[PDB]
Amino acid sequence: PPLQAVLVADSFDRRFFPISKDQPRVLLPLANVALIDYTLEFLTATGVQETFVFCCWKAAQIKEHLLKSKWCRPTSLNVVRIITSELYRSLGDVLRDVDAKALVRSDFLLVYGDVISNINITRALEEHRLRRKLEKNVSVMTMIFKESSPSHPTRCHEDNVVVAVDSTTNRVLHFQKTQGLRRFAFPLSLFQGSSDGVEVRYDLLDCHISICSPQVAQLFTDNFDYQTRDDFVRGLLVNEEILGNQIHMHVTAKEYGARVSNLHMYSAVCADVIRRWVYPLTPEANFTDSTTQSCTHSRHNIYRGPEVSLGHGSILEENVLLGSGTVIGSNCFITNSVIGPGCHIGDNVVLDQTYLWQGVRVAAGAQIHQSLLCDNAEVKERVTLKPRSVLTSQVVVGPNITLPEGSVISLHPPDAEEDEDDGEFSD
């Protein structure tokens, strides 16, 4: 049978506020490319071809950009249906909705908005198939996950995962997050279930590439009380007395799938995809034939779009996706950056770890750090910033003005810790 993949392009961890004001979450430029693109290239890599995307909040801009998709070409292998429904705000309803129109034939692979991945599901896909039809629907879900180590910057302060699993069929036994739990709690339910070895793990990522089966749309319709996948899995893990038909977990070893959630996660995944950690996917492969993403990979992980006019003596040690249209002056010391298109720079500037974007601009001698910007975001002479110091929506900063850490300024007083300005204070 074909391999169809439900997909929702509004991850309800609505954290990229105020950034979510101008352009929606999913459309975000990570490395001058749509995350949703990364996801779609993934879907094509594992070879699925009938993908059902979904966006409720701000579906307009989604279609606006995705009409010219790498997979919205007539030659594409993937067919897409942006069902522009603005009723649900929890995945529960969209899963009962793919129930409500019998879209998924059978054996689908649901996926959140902006998973960064290179994973070949086919190994999983087939073992799922095996223990689902050589076992006749005793499965409902076969979670896929990716081995890691806790200390990595993939698991930010916010989100980790810890899970009890079996070791014979690798079936899930319990799933739970660990936002500040110096201890944990596992019931002997585990062992009164079976006396042949049980495993606990804290070294799987929040891969969020759940394989599933339309009877998951069943398990969501039959009980209208689930609003997220974790709701699903813990409800089914407690409802094992009857009609559980538990999850058959499975971990990979060689790939990299992360459901980017928070600005720290975006940070980590961007400055790991520049390091080719996911390759095939990296903008010098220009996987979206979209023109201006011609990225002339070069010495020592320095990427370089065409026509960057890099400034004299501007050292750039590593991992600098200088996008198209850029221009740079003398001594501009960039590092780990992502300089999008339309980025004029001054002199003596340092931009360690920064993430500029399109439209951005900056004058001379303007040290920055750990930063982030957005469309026409501007900071003039001798400004300075600090970790997570977002600033978007064309915000400006005046000369001489240092700024503190969380300086998330934007086009709104009430939500940003500043407002659209051309100084520092005074909205």
Binding site: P150, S167, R182, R183, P187, L188, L190, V198, V200, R201
Partner: protein, 343 residues
């Protein structure tokens, strides 16, 4: 040397084979001249002469008091313990080549060790050497509490409810001392070891080094279990029935018997072991069970799965079924029922 085969054994090496003596025997096979063997002095001296009844030129006998818990008797014998001890429990009947556990110990400077053949769910490491948790359902109701620290350091844990440990603990002198000041810690197996593992986390830290086993075990309240042992025992008796007045006509099926014993006519034995120097010589049959001596046997013992210990008798009309022979059986005919009965 660096050890002492101190044996925490209380309470007899029954059968056609000196069972209780066998932990000694086996450690004796691999060096270990010294064997501290605590005895039973809750009433009288009923255990030491029983060791004078044995054949190891280097054994030692230790009297005791009313009640001696494991760590309690540890603290008791503590002074004469002047090395890294090697404690050991009563019913070691297990062909484990002990070189593996002391191997692991002598390797990773282990503050402890133990064994586990295949209550008491445990968490063992990925590599299966540095265990990380032990408990039982008695300890706590249901919540497998594991302090997030260790999962934040030791990444992947396998579990084990399918275990039969053998209470064998290679130690280190300073842990014996750490116990000697801990007057309240009564028993090693129940409280000490889990306390130490609890204190594994707040290289000069401590260690715990378990081991999975699939060869033999430690006997408990069902001693008919070690009939397994009996069936297997003769293999242990390769160079370390076997010698008796045999009949070669009566049923011999995985049997065992000592010399100068019940040799008569018209008997049988099916898949079990026997006693030594008792009265079983009349018209008899198998009992698929084991017996101790001084139990006059006669008239076709149609029994199955029981014990005929001392203080028993039967003659000329006898028949039984899974009814153990305890004390107070001056019997000659008592048709028994296979349910729980010890007459």
């Amino acid at each position: 040397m660096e050890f002492q085969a101190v044996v925490m054994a209380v309470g007899l090496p029954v059968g056609n084979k000196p069972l209780i003596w066998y932990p000694l025997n086996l450690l004796e096979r691999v060096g270990f001249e010294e064997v501290i063997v605590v005895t039973t002095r809750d009433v009288q001296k009923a255990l030491c002469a029983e060791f004078k009844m044995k054949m190891k030129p280097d054994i030692v006998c230790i009297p005791d008091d009313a009640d001696m818990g494991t760590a309690d008797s540890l603290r008791y014998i503590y002074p004469k313990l002047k090395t890294d001890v090697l404690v050991l429990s009563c019913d070691l009947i297990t062909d484990v080549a002990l070189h593996e556990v002391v191997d692991l110990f002598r390797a990773y400077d282990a503050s402890l060790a133990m064994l586990m053949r295949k209550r008491d769910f445990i968490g063992v490491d990925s590599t299966g050497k540095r265990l990380l948790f032990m408990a039982n359902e008695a300890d706590l109701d249901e919540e497998l509490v594991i302090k997030g620290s260790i999962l934040q350091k030791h990444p992947r844990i396998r579990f084990h409810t399918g275990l039969v440990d053998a209470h064998l603990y290679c130690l280190k002198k300073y842990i014996v001392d750490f116990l000697m000041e801990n007057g309240s810690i009564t028993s090693i197996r129940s409280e000490l070891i889990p306390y130490l593992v609890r204190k594994q986390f707040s290289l000069k830290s401590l260690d715990i080094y378990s081991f999975i086993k699939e060869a033999n075990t430690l006997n408990l309240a069902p001693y008919d279990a070690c009939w397994n042992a009996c069936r297997g025992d003769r293999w242990e008796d390769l160079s370390r029935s076997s010698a008796q007045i045999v009949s070669k006509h009566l049923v011999g099926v995985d049997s065992l018997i000592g010399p100068e014993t019940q040799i008569g006519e018209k008997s049988s034995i099916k898949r079990s072991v026997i006693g030594s120097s008792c009265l079983i010589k009349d018209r008899v049959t198998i009992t698929n069970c084991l017996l101790m001596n001084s139990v006059t046997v006669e008239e076709g013992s149609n029994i199955q799965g029981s014990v005929i210990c001392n203080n028993a008798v039967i003659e000329k009309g006898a028949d039984i079924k899974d009814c153990l022979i305890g004390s107070g059986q001056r019997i000659e005919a008592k048709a028994k029922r296979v349910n729980e009965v010890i007459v």
